[PDB]
Swiss-Prot record, chains A, B, C, D, E, F, G, H, I, J, K, L:
The chain holds residues 1 to 100 of 540 of the full protein. Adapter required for innate immune defense against viruses. Acts downstream of DHX33, RIGI and IFIH1/MDA5, which detect intracellular dsRNA produced during viral replication, to coordinate pathways leading to the activation of NF-kappa-B, IRF3 and IRF7, and to the subsequent induction of antiviral cytokines such as IFNB and RANTES (CCL5). Peroxisomal and mitochondrial MAVS act sequentially to create an antiviral cellular state. Self-associates and polymerizes (via CARD domains) to form 400 nM long three-stranded helical filaments on mitochondria, filament nucleation requires interaction with RIGI whose CARD domains act as a template for filament assembly. Interacts with RIGI, IFIH1/MDA5, TRAF2, TRAF6 and C1QBP. May interact with FADD, RIPK1, CHUK and IKBKB. Interacts (when phosphorylated) with IRF3; following activation and phosphorylation on the pLxIS motif by TBK1, recruits IRF3. Interacts with NLRX1. Interaction with NLRX1 requires the CARD domain. Interacts with PSMA7. Interacts with TRAFD1. (Microbial infection) Interacts with hepatitis C virus (HCV) NS3/4A protease; this interaction leads to MAVS cleavage, thereby preventing the establishment of an antiviral state. The lineage of its organism: Eukaryota, Metazoa, Chordata, Craniata, Vertebrata. The gene is MAVS. Residues 12-79 are annotated as: Required for interaction with NLRX1. The pLxIS motif constitutes an IRF3-binding motif: following phosphorylation by TBK1, the phosphorylated pLxIS motif of MAVS recruits IRF3. IRF3 is then phosphorylated and activated by TBK1 to induce type-I interferons and other cytokines. Both CARD and transmembrane domains are essential for antiviral function. The CARD domain is responsible for interaction with RIGI and IFIH1/MDA5. This is Mitochondrial antiviral-signaling protein. It is found in: Mitochondrion outer membrane; Mitochondrion; Peroxisome.
Length: 102, 102, 102, 102, 102, 102, 102, 102, 102, 102, 102, 102
């Protein structure tokens, strides 16, 4: 299998420029997330008590889908958080590369 | 045991489109709730001071029955909050699937 | 000790159907209350500024005696507020069960 | 479901230019409102004591129907408050977009 | 000595379907617990800072009695947390097998 | 030294049946407390932001004297909170056992 | 430096017997206060919305000077609130001990 | 920028000796005020319902210009309220210090 | 991308000299804000209950646009709050530097 | 390089006698701070959820400049918090020793 | 050199009856400690993440002075934590034996 | 190949005077790092549980690039952490020597 280069590249981008992604409440990211589960809520709760919002920040991002590809679920949360600029950045870097099923 | 798929599915729905469920006071949800207890009141109080209304919002939903199945107790609170549309959404997604005792 | 099941059961009832208990002024409940203290007045004052009359409503109920058993003090306030129906409801559910000292 | 873009857009408009909507008494908005309930009266009462008329102003608007779509109920209150200009503004922005049942 | 097969079997059950046991606050489990000690409070505190609520969750279960047999103390906490279904599950699997003193 | 068995026994009792001790405001317990210090106020403040009123509840109890023996300081706070029943429970279990200086 | 034992001792006294200090309006304490600043007004405002008058009560006391020694500023407010007895209590306990500059 | 020391100093003075400034109707201060706006009228209205005339008193003072420097607008209102003594006090403390544009 | 140095610089300025920005009601900032949404109203509500007006103050500023660049939306709110001086300060520091699209 | 002995010495002093530094709101220290950044706000937020105000207290002090030398930035915050005594203590111990550029 | 028998003896005592020493916050022990350094703060931080408060408890005790003799620094922290009994225990066992410089 | 003498020399410097580099959160170093990968996040996680922040501190430094030359990536993280002095120290010692491609 070919590891989604866009997911990893977009992963480090959000983690590096996180300072700009911290201008929103975790709500618009975890509960606001279309598909969710109770088990996921408890998971983030643990990370919260772990250290702080920083660990809960990046952790949540990966927690959204618990697997690579959460880029689409992320951009969605942005669309609902009035994050027009942030939505374009993530959607652009991801759209820059995509696999094709033969 | 078979985990209520409707409870989980309906759980994420309310949490995602919570923006529309925030058009009502927590009163119609916690005190207005038919069966309640003092211990429950103190619990939500804690979550209130925790961070804000957001955490108290989703937390309350799960706090209503403290266990899966609060969908019926929720729709009830809606019927008392003049929430006709909200009551149909939750009651529909839940009625879409139900177990049968053989 | 056996927790007064009537107090808890009657507690949730008043909290759920509070919509009907909101047809009276807090006066008939706090000052009108036979036994009272200055400290109690200041307490409710705090809850008032907390959020609104809703929180001050249920809070006052528990504030009346600050402990379980305020059912008798409540029904009394009703008798003085011309609340004949309300007095019968609370007095009935409570009279439905009572402990006996052996 | 498609969130009423007109309701949200009209919501921020009334909230921004509220300075002009404050030229009327809350009466023409809450009691004057065709369909109403006692529970609603107590709700606004709470917000009143919360802080002031400002919070009670915007809160009442959302309290009118407790759900999106109160635009029609609002314009109605305007028609009864001799608010010809205000009625046209709200009725226009809303009429600018409407869903169709296929 | 015969290791309580019910304690171990019930132990893995609670740990596997913990997702459903996470619908309650740790309060109803640690402080609410009938017999407790200060030393126990500090112990769980340590596990809390260890990683998160997950480790503190399962750890607390074993911390309740610090020894096998906490099944009775657990079901008790459930009875006080309005956990009727959870109380039946644990009480059933345990009652399914019990030793007899000859 | 002999660890006050009454303090520990009374400690778990208040923590287990805390549901009944939550019918009072923390004020009657921390500020109302005869001997107090500014440093103590800040301590509880921290626990408040920690999680909620639950942690601040039990924590405050131990914070009252920061050492075993706060049973006398507790019963006092009860006497000032009109807690006649609660005062008898704590004062009884404690009076049930006391050391004697030879 | 030697921490003002009178300030701390007088601090707990006012906080314990606060029930008697609650017989006056916060006005005679904050605005009536000789030296004041706008920044201070906003601070207390925050505490007000925090929980209630209780937190705003003790908080204001410390907010008066934001530092130990507000005993003189407090007794002053009492002199202006017709609080003769209260003024003597605070002024006495403080006068009971005072440092001397060598 | 240099914060107007006269505005702050004069601010606390009016707030402390407010007892003497309460000998006039709010009219001579809000409507009588030369430059005013409808939005300002609604603002004070909110504070009025907030608690009482006390909060509306000091609040109005800051509401007059919503920014530091209202000392000139205040003294004006005094000149129109026959407040000769009050006008001299405020005008003196302010004239005691003034900035110069180089 | 080049992080708006003006937004950050202006951000700390408003946060440091906030004492002067606290001379206005949050209304002129949140509801008065041209473009707004219901979801935003609930967000600030949470911060309100969090601690006080202080946290709600700075939080609101960032909440206005939930992203950098709210300087234009802020200055606007000032223009509507009769804040001539405040409007010039923010508009000046921002106009001091601006990017150009090649 | 020569490690600022004054910074370390003053660091332990503030941390030891912190009990006196806890008489002020974190606002006068973090937002009130002249030069600040959004990234810094999020950092302290994390520490807040970490444990309580205690950790956020000392952490904030070091967070002010994230590097040794924040003594000047600290004393500044004191000057704005009406902390005359506190400002002299920190400014004195620091002025007691200073390096000279040859 | 003669190894301080009192330090070792007192070391095991605090470690054995630690259950009673856990009734205080680590603050009164590490930051409250008169002489401290930044390097020490980071050290304890590491132990914190190591396992829990238990390891951080005993570790901190030895971390206070990083060398034998911290008994005096410990008793000091107790004097500031209102720990009268604890202060006497440690101060007594230590005073029971002391070296003399010939 | 010629082993980067600057990397090794700068490596020991940061490790020796680490006490000053511990005045920043690991966030500004790992996530904030421009180019990053998920695999790297898990690696540091392991070191975290290994012993403490100390091991995670130096380990992270080498983990940033997993190979010599991370000096440029380090100085970058400093520029984003407001570390002006730290950035000059590392950038200077490194710039003191550099290879040239013939």
């Amino acid at each position: 299998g070919s590891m989604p280069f866009a997911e990893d590249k977009t992963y480090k981008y959000i983690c590096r420029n996180f300072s700009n992604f911290c201008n929103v409440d975790v709500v618009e990211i975890l509960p606001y997330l279309p598909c969710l589960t109770a088990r996921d809520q408890d998971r983030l709760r643990a990370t919260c008590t772990l250290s702080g919002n920083r660990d809960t920040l990046w952790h949540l991002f990966n927690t959204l889908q618990r697997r690579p590809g959460w880029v689409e679920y992320f951009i969605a949360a942005l669309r609902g958080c009035e994050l027009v600029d942030l939505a374009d950045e993530v959607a652009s870097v991801y759209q820059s590369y995509q696999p094709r099923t033969s």
